[PDB]
């Protein structure tokens, strides 16, 4: 190991990519980008698996190079570009838009959205930075640096930006009572209400999240992505609403659907 890796094996891929075993030894290693390699989604996998617009790896490249792919309002021509969490995908040829958000379980799911909703993007600030002349900065989770924000923005206050210019439009404070999203972890993709937060010096802070059906769980502070002001959210939730319904109720609902179908 005299340098960085360039090849990724098929079984070394994360499970939320949902690759198969017999079709080849290698896996598409994503290029370096805004999101981490372990938590992202390449454009090739999404295009050839979630919608099946292509069949081979050459055909999705023929799809991608012709400037028919818009990610975060900008045209992307890379087949290994990491399209991570909360990103927006715009297809102007078919007039359809997609937003990359998690399902009830730990994987990405497709989500059709209206074009008028596809103009903003919620981002979580990582740190508050002061510039070279006393000017304030802001680093989001996708490393989009914003200059001159609102001075009430704190270290973990999620903001709403606009795609075509890059300006701050609105923000949600981090307080107990706001509806929240979790990214990364065992109970990934759950919708709940933040109730408590423990402050551990020199370690990781743990908050307590209460579901709408009275279920309670916990996770680290860095896996907290608040999306709502109290109870009403800002983005339309998908089917299932991230409720994490149990296995027995899942089987009961599946047999209810099966005997309703016939």
């Amino acid at each position: 190991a005299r340098g960085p890796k360039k090849h990724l094996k098929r079984v070394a891929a994360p499970k939320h990519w949902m690759l198969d075993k017999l079709t080849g030894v290698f896996a598409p290693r994503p290029s370096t980008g805004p999101h981490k390699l372990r938590e992202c989604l390449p454009l090739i996998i999404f295009l050839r698996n979630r919608l099946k617009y292509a069949l081979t790896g050459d055909e999705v490249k023929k799809i991608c190079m012709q400037r028919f792919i818009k990610i975060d309002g900008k045209v992307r021509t890379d087949i290994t570009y990491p399209a991570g969490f909360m990103d927006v995908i715009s297809i102007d040829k078919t007039g359809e838009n997609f937003r990359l958000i998690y399902d009830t379980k730990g994987r990405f799911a497709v989500h059709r959205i209206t074009p008028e909703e596809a103009k903003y993007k919620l981002c979580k600030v990582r740190k508050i930075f002061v510039g070279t002349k006393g000017i304030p900065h802001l680093v989001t989770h996708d490393a989009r640096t914003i200059r001159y924000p609102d001075p009430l923005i704190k270290v973990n206050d999620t903001i709403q930006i606009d795609l075509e210019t890059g300006k701050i439009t609105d923000f949600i404070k981090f307080d107990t009572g706001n509806l929240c999203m979790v990214t990364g972890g065992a109970n990934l993709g759950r919708i709940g209400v933040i109730t408590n937060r423990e402050r551990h010096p020199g370690s990781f802070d743990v908050v307590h999240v209460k579901d709408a059906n009275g279920n309670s769980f916990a996770t680290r502070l860095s896996n907290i992505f608040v999306i709502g002001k109290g109870n009403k959210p800002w983005i339309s939730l998908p089917r299932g609403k991230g409720i994490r319904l149990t296995i027995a109720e899942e089987r009961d609902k599946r047999l209810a659907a099966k005997q309703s179908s016939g």
């Binding site: 094996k9 075993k21 080849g24 030894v25 296995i247 027995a248």
Partner: protein, 185 residues
């Protein structure tokens, strides 16, 4: 680094005491009754029964109102009543331990063909299944180790390509007719 599978398992099991009287005569009785080629098939059914019995014992070693025990037990009872080993009334986890191997062998394909009345004998049913004459759910099967489900039991008829339940006459009938026509004139 190739794209292979490398996964396999042994389906039968070898018994500890190979050289005896009682269960050897019992296995010969099962072979002569239900028409089996060798003892590897009956050892395979004994191994499947042993796996089901071990799963049932590891389910009964837990406690009542356990979600894992209830879920796996309900799945096992649903699969066993889908196969047809058990009855709808006796849908409990304790009825798994009180079944034998001939309950598995009543749902074999040769036994069902013989008991449906469209076969002469058990060995005749086996050699007729192996020779591609009987279809189920309009799909022609070839194999006699076919576990017939409860919902696919009333759809066992002759194939449409067979010379028995409608089709072209066979090779030896046309050969005999052509030989008789050549000899007559």
């Amino acid at each position: 680094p190739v794209a292979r599978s490398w996964v396999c398992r042994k389906t039968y099991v070898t018994p500890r005491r190979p050289f005896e009287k009682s269960r050897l005569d019992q296995e010969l009785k099962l072979i002569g009754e239900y028409g089996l080629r060798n003892k590897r098939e009956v050892w395979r059914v004994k191994f499947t029964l042993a796996k089901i019995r071990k799963a049932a014992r590891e389910l009964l070693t837990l406690d009542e109102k356990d979600p894992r025990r209830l879920f796996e037990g309900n799945a096992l009872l649903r699969r066993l009543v889908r196969i047809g080993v058990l009855d709808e009334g006796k849908m409990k986890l304790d009825y798994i331990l009180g079944l034998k191997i001939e309950d598995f062998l009543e749902r074999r394909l040769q036994t069902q063909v013989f008991k449906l009345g469209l076969a002469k004998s058990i060995h005749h049913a086996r050699v007729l299944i192996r020779q591609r004459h009987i279809r189920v759910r309009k799909q022609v099967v070839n194999i006699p180790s076919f576990i017939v489900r409860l919902d696919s039991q009333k759809h066992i008829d002759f194939s449409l390509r067979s010379p028995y339940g409608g089709g072209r006459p066979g090779r030896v009938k046309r050969k005999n007719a052509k030989k008789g026509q050549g000899g007559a004139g």
